[PDB]
Short mmCIF file of C-alpha atoms and ligand atoms in Angstrom, two decimals:
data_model
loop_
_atom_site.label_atom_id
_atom_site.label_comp_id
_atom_site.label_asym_id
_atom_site.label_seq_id
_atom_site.Cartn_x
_atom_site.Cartn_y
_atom_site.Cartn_z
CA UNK D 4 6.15 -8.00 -1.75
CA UNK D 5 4.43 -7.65 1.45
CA UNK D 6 4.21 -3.71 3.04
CA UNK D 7 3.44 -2.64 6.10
CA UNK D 8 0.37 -0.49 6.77
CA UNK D 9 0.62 2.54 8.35
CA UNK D 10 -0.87 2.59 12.07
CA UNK D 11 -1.12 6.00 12.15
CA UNK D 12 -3.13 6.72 8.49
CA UNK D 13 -5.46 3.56 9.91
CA UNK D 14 -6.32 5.85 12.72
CA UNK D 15 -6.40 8.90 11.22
CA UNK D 16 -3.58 10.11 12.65
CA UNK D 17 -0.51 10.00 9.77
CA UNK D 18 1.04 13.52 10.01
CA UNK D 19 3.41 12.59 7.84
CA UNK D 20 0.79 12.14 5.14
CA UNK D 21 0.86 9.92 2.12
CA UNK D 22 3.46 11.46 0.14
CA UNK D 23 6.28 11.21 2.90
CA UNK D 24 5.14 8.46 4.44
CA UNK D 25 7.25 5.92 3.90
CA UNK D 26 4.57 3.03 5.88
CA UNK D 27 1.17 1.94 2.86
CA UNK D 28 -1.88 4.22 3.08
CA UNK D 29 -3.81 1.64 1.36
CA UNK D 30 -7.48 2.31 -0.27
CA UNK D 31 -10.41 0.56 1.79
CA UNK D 32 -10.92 -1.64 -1.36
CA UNK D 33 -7.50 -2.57 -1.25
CA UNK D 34 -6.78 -6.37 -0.11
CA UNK D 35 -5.29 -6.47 3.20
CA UNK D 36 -3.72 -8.95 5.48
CA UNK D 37 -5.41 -8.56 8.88
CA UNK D 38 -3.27 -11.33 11.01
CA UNK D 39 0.00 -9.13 10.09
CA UNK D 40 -1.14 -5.62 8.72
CA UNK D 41 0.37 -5.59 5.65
CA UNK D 42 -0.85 -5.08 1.57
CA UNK D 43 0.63 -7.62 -0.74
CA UNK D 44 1.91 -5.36 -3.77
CA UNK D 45 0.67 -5.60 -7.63
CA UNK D 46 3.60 -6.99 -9.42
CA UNK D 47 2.86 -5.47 -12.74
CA UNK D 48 2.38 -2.16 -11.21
CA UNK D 49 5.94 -2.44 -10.16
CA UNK D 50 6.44 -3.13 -13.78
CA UNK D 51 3.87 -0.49 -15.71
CA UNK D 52 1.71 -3.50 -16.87
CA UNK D 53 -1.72 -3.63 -14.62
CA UNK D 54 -4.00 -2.38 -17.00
CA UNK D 55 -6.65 -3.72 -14.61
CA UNK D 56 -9.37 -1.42 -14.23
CA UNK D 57 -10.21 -2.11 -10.67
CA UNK D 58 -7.37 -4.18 -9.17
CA UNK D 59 -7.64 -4.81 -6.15
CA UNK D 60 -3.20 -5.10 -5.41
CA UNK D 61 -1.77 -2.40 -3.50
CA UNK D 62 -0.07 0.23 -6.27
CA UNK D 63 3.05 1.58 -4.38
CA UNK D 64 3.83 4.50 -4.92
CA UNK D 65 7.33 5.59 -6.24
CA UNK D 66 8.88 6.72 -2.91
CA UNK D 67 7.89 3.51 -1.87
CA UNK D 68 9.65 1.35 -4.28
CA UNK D 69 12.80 3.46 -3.83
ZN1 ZN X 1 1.55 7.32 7.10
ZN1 ZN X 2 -2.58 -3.71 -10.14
#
């Protein structure tokens, strides 16, 4: 799974906010593809199972997923 960023949060400028917003509002320690803008997702997050204590996989959020 590969999402696309949201332009907007980037710039500070997402007035949809990260709840709505149905674009990533990934953390800055979050890996990120910079030739296409997107976050490649956790798998096991998707699944319950990243125990991880500091991955480093996007964690999409429910609305997300849906
Ligand atoms: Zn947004
Ligand atoms: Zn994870």
């Amino acid at each position: 799974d590969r999402l696309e960023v949201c332009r907007e949060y980037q710039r500070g400028n997402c007035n949809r906010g990260e709840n709505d917003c149905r674009f990533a509002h990934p953390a800055d320690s979050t890996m990120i593809d910079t030739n296409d803008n997107t976050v490649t997702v956790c798998m096991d997050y998707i699944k319950g199972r990243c125990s991880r204590e500091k991955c480093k996989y996007f964690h999409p959020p429910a609305h997300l997923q849906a």
